[PDB]
Design a binder for this molecule. Structure first.
Ligand SMILES: Nc1ncnc2c1ncn2[C@@H]1O[C@H](COP(=O)(O)OP(=O)(O)NP(=O)(O)O)[C@@H](O)[C@H]1O
Ligand SMILES: Nc1ncnc2c1ncn2[C@@H]1O[C@H](COP(=O)(O)OP(=O)(O)NP(=O)(O)O)[C@@H](O)[C@H]1O
Ligand SMILES: O=C(NOC[C@H](O)CO)c1ccc(F)c(F)c1Nc1ccc(I)cc1F
Ligand SMILES: [Cl-]
Ligand SMILES: [Mg+2]
Ligand SMILES: [Mg+2]
Lengths: 312, 276
């Protein structure tokens, strides 16, 4: 991989810690605290006593046949090969006590969903760095593994006090995705309009999801349906209606005047409903917004710790 | 305390079994084995609590051989529903986890008993609201017991007297108009019939619907819009033609086109007799 000297240093340190971790067993973990819960899972900060490591442990309770469960556990093992500065590190996936455990690196900044609540709105110059990290994460996953994320959203972009921005919860296991489709529901959606209608345009839907996520973090509010009038100058829809809106209504857009023209063009190109006219990953990486963001010096770690209340 | 309310510290709460769309189930002891479902609604307003008690007064009178016995409720330490503990597995576990090989005479009989219990619920004017094979138990490998019916008041958290209803748990059994959540009353006898149609699908195919689609939001949108419906050609070859027809009638997109359970029960019973 490309990697500056610092990124290759942290990547190496992670592989070193990972060698201390043999087989993961439920008895070897100690609960520290809860990190959050989704609509189909729960994540705990834990200590792995044999290794001394702190990890985030996601537990998923699926009532599925053992052959499907075993395939899910097999497919997740590919996460051992997913090593990139823009991908949440991975320690192991196993089954025990009716629960699928996925043990990953602990990100002390939380998700950008949490960060967004604490920030109100995330500044454009911070969003530039986030976009670079997401584009690069999605590129890594597609080029090195043929993986399509399929779940880009603020709660699946994790950050930490070192300033790293990393993707997680991507579709390494199509069996896991399918089992979860059968068992749970969300309350909102970042799915692209063409996939809602059953059309598959590779990573173009992840790009749509990103654009949607960037609008939500820019304005401080999930953007389907668009803000109504005076709501915007301060600067609940059911799941089916949200999906119908995505499919049948024009895509969201940033407010004018508040954001740079490059940033507005960048999200507009992401949110084109036509998945072929939508920008792809190569085109976004050279977009003016990204070229500008990549050259700005932004103390992302400083801004995050400040936003969260942590120390430097 | 109140009628059919179990006071604090009478139920010995044992092992946690799992959680579903609106609660978390524990195995418990209270004059025998019970399932205790701790409701997600932990903080209920006086209006919500009152409407819940009124609903419990209805549910506790729904006694029938194919209905899981409603045993009581608790408010302390937390809101909870106490029901008969089922030995063995739900129909969902039998079909999709154990892969129990039933013969066709016994698949029909499971559908018969379910229609029997659903017929009773509707005769008592109760919308189930949540029929699915996880809520059908084959008790002691013999009798079908339908569970988790009614309880509309606790399937949504309340902001005063108004409650916002959101989809929760699996969507596979929801009728198009339940998915849409747009009508005044999305839930109806006919939306139960649709869910039963899906149960029939599981019995006659051995599979959940939409097995070829792993994108949940595509399913929600397309089922809701009427663009997508169960693939009836997955039905196994030994399924009687009349059962396939009945299934298709239960699954009609327009609720007014769906039969009711007296007619459904009469069809299955006829089919059971005119069967090898
Ligand atoms: N590696 C991690 N380190 C720290 N916090 C984490 C980590 N992974 C997940 N979390 C937190 O755990 C929360 C729950 O995650 P998750 O179960 O994937 O649901 P979700 O992404 O928040 N929402 P949803 O996917 O719609 O069900 C996330 O929002 C994060 O706040
Ligand atoms: N009366 C019961 N006896 C034994 N096991 C039960 C009983 N009720 C529920 N369970 C089990 O407890 C777990 C949780 O059930 P539950 O919370 O009802 O979710 P669900 O049935 O899968 N979906 P839903 O009922 O719509 O919320 C499942 O493994 C059930 O099989
Ligand atoms: O976790 C996933 N989705 O979110 C789950 C929430 O609990 C839903 O509420 C998920 C879905 C498909 C898949 F293949 C995975 F590998 C998943 N998990 C997953 C993937 C990479 C890392 I590094 C860490 C992880 F955990
Ligand atoms: Cl408890
Ligand atoms: Mg997540
Ligand atoms: Mg249930």
């Amino acid at each position: 991989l490309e990697l500056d000297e610092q990124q290759r240093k942290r990547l190496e340190a992670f592989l070193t810690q990972k060698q201390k971790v043999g087989e993961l067993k439920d008895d070897d973990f100690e609960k520290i605290s809860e990190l959050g819960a989704g609509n189909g899972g729960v994540v705990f900060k834990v200590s792995h006593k044999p290794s001394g490591l702190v990890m985030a442990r996601k537990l998923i309770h699926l009532e599925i046949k053992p052959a499907i469960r075993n395939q899910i556990i097999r497919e997740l093992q590919v996460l051992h090969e997913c090593n990139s500065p823009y991908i949440v590190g991975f320690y192991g996936a196993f089954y025990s006590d009716g629960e699928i455990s996925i043990c990953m690196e602990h990100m002390d900044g939380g998700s950008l969903d949490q960060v967004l609540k604490k920030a109100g709105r995330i500044p454009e110059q911070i969003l530039g760095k986030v976009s670079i990290a997401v584009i690069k994460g999605l590129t890594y996953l597609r080029e090195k593994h043929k993986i399509m994320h399929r779940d880009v959203k603020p709660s699946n972009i994790l950050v930490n006090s070192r300033g790293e921005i990393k993707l997680c919860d991507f579709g390494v296991s199509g069996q896991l995705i399918d089992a979860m489709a059968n068992a749970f529901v969300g309350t909102r959606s970042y799915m692209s309009p063409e996939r809602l209608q059953g059309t598959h345009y590779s990573v173009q839907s992840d790009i749509w999801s990103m654009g949607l996520s960037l609008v939500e973090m820019a304005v401080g509010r999930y953007p389907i349906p668009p803000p109504d009038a005076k709501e915007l100058e301060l600067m609940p829809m059911a799941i089916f209606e949200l999906l119908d809106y995505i499919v049948n209504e024009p895509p969201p857009k940033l407010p004018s005047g508040v954001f740079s023209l490059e940033f507005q063009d960048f999200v507009n190109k992401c949110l084109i409903k036509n998945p072929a006219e939508r920008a792809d990953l190569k085109q976004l990486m050279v977009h003016a917004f990204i070229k500008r963001s990549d050259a700005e010096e932004v103390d992302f770690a400083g801004w995050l710790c400040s936003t969260i209340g942590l120390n430097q | 305390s109140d009628d059919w309310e179990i006071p604090d510290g009478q139920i010995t709460v044992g092992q946690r079994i799992g959680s579903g769309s609106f609660g978390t189930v524990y195995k418990g002891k209270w004059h025998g084995d019970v399932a205790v479902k701790m409701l997600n609604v932990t903080a209920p307003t006086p209006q919500q609590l009152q409407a819940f008690k009124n609903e419990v007064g209805v549910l506790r009178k729904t006694r029938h051989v194919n209905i899981l016995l409603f045993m009581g409720y608790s408010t302390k330490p937390q809101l909870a529903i106490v029901t008969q503990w089922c030995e063995g597995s739900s129909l969902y576990h039998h079909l999709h986890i154990i892969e129990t090989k039933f013969e066709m005479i016994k698949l029909i009989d499971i559908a018969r008993q379910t229609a029997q219990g659903m017929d009773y619920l509707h005769a008592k004017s109760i919308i189930h609201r949540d029929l699915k094979s996880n809520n059908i138990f084959l008790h002691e490998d013999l009798t079908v017991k339908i569970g988790d019916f009614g309880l509309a008041t606790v399937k949504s958290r309340w902001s005063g007297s108004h409650q916002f209803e959101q989809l929760s748990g699996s969507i596979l059994w929801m009728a198009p108009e339940v998915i849409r959540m747009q009508d005044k009353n999305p839930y109806s006898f006919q939306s139960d019939v649709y869910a039963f149609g899906i149960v029939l699908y599981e019995l006659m195919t051995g599979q959940l619907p939409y097995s070829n689609i792993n994108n949940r939001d595509q399913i929600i949108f397309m089922v809701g819009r009427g663009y997508l419906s169960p693939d009836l050609s997955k039905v196994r070859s030994n399924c009687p033609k009349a059962m396939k027809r009945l299934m298709a009638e239960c699954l009609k997109k327009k609720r007014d086109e769906r039969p009711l359970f007296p007619q459904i029960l009469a069809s299955i019973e006829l089919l059971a007799r005119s069967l090898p």
